[PDB]
């Protein structure tokens, strides 16, 4: 899920 992407 995109909500897990960092920065």
């Amino acid at each position, epitope marked *: *899920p*995109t*909500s*897990s*992407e*960092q*920065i």
Partner: antibody
Amino acid sequence: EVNLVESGGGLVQPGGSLRLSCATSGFTFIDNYMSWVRQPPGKALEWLGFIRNKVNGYTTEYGPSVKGRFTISRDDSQSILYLQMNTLRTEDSATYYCVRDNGSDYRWYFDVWGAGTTVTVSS
Amino acid sequence: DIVMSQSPSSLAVSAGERVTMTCKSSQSLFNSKTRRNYLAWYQQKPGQSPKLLIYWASTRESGVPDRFTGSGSGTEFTLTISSVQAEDLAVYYCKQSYNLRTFGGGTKLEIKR
């Protein structure tokens, strides 16, 4: 303070194309994910898509309604965000908004919005 | 592709009364890694750009009056407003940011008199 200002929104004949800009100031642009949201008159907000930062490969994601027809890009040296609109339809008539897609601490919400630029698609 | 549904479409309320509005998502907006439900609430007053009120389902944005409380998790969320003021006239949109982003159809808050 943080400012976002969309430009390029005008009257365009159906079928033609148009490129919107979002000039920014007040924050480190290169560190952010940026999205575009629109809204037809008296209608609901619609997420158009976003573009990841340099650290994430400048890749993009779109909403079903525009995927394939619109292209989001950016110029980190200028702190400007672009939205290329091709094959315009009447359904494209709307106020287009530029937003900061805050990713820090995994928040993932739109904390800053521009005033919007209006696109009218008619003959 | 997560579908968001809001209800009611529009509600009329008097200054001082409380109001509640719901948002339903077709999929769980909860993230196991981050431990947060990615549902945010936006307030859009007449002629203005939308404004963030609440994120992570129940966290209130800086500067947002305490009478605005968000709650829920999974697929059913709620936006509650205690002691509504006239100034609260606006359309309230929920939005999921679990995967991509999707806006609800919005709830139009009208002021009774």
